[PDB]
């Protein structure tokens, strides 16, 4: 397998099916990518992570800098053999989690140093650094480092950060080109950023394209906007993206929001609520999500959902699983994640068949129909 | 398979290695039942906990009694329905736990009455009742309702008790008997009591043979007399129960405790150790216990154990479970707990092998020199 190849094996409108081939695996595109957060998925063994059909996990930069660090990681072999998941790992730049969890930020043009909210450590962050540390927990898709924008946003404010962000898009590139063994192994992808404003997200496109990625992420969203602003900006600012590169919407999401992010052109995802929301009692289903505490469900010997595939489905009744939540049982986080990233998975295999055969459209609308029912 | 049949294959002083036959499957003794408290062996799905080597797991009455239920969970199709474990299950009598968890107990030569440590509710607990909550659980092998000797106890006090369970020893068998069902198809095991007094063993023994019973547990032990009062005791005690049956002994225990427990001629055991401990940090190796949150592992990327054949040690470094331990991730507890009731079984496989192979002497000599090095 090369680098990077990603290739488009059929289109529907903006949506589009393929795959990235790169050393560590093919991932089947549209993705969802299961988040680890301190080199673990929570609840789940790799291999568990991998049988619902995961073929790409994400990791947190900012939380793998803190515990256990980067350059211990390196030492004991990378993030991959440290975790036991020997397929690709996209990192995020770190950036993200700086701003939201931890303490006294001092930001700069140069980067952002901080506390740590575990202890009073303090520590930084630069394009370059940030670019290292990827590069010493061996990720395969490095996600160049940017300045979050906030929502809402001044069209001032949205703009310096957006022009800082292209800043450090080429300070992270060049860091990137100028580490051999990163270079030739793992992949960069740019982030645009802009806010909600269609000719900040056409600079920031332009200017990301300029500098040249393997892929384009859409920043900034997701951040309080609301489903049909998120929607309406993804209208104007994924065609901006070079369309034979992937489109990276970071930090989506529920079910329905990827569903219509795809209808706009996105290629990739994340998201921590299959995994959050399922430790807190929330199971998707076909027919909507469902908390599963719900005493409703106390004595209801069905599965979970009553068509997903995954082996909590195949094994256990909703009335096990409303027991193991409600007495805080390790099995019941165990059970309840793995069937919410195996109807994630499901739910991108749904949307990968039905792109394939022309036929996204009804799915989107047989989908949205029967889950808000 | 029948019923119940309890047979010795082979013989080393007072060690015994066999088998127990029962509807359900086969158990290898000497035997170490993992606890499954609340309907789950904490933090592993049931066919890992299989895979470990057990061939039984233990249920706690008492807690799945306060919840989910138990007629609850009969009408959901017995406990075995409910967790998904299809092999024999044990389930305690629920009178041990009551002393330890509940509030304001009343005690009476009728039963106990009792408020959850959960809720504010009361609920009770006779020999009747514990046997037909067994029952509704499905239990496989049902304990008689004993009343628990607290360490230390005076020798009128433990008469009185060790009288006492001997009277709801013959309640539990006839309450046993009475239902059809459970009669044929489950199997009974009376509990010897008398603290540490001979005399009192010894008339407790008598009239549980008198009665009869499928197995015979050695009750009271492990209450905080140490490990050369227990062996003393187990010395004189263990011979006074019907050799053709087999010995349990409830509660116990650390690895060096069972080894000398099988010396004396225990067939069966059970602790929450190996589970708790785990989530707690504390691995068990063949050079005796380590704590993995200790800093010296932090980046030591050999195996838990250098023996252990258990799928933890085959994929995870001492390295990384350190840093799921100190993060407080799910992972951590799964892999620990995994480990450690893998170990248990090892252990067990090893004393069955030896005994089978008239070397058990030995082996329990080479252990003790290696475990405490
Ligand atoms: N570096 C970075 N990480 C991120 N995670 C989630 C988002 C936006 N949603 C984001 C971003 O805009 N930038
Ligand atoms: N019913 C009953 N349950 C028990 N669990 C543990 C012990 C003693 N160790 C015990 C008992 O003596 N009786
Ligand atoms: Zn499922
Ligand atoms: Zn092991």
Redesign the interface.
Known sequence: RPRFSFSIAAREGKARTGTIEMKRGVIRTPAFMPVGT???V????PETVRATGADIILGNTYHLML??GAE?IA???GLHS???WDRPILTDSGGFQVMSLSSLTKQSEEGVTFKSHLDGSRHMLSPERSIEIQHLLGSDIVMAFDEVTPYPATPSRAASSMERSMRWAKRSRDAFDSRKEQAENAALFGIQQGSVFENLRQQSADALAEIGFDGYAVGGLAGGEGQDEMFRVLDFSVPMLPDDKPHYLMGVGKPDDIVGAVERGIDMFDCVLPTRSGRNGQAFTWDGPINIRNARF??D?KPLDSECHCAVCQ???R??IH??I??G???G??LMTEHNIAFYQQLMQKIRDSISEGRFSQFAQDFRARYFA
């Open positions: 301190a080199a673990t929570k609840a789940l063994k515990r256990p211990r030492k004991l072999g440290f975790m036991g106390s004595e010997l094994k256990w009744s009335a096990y027991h193991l409600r007495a049982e390790i099995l986080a165990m």
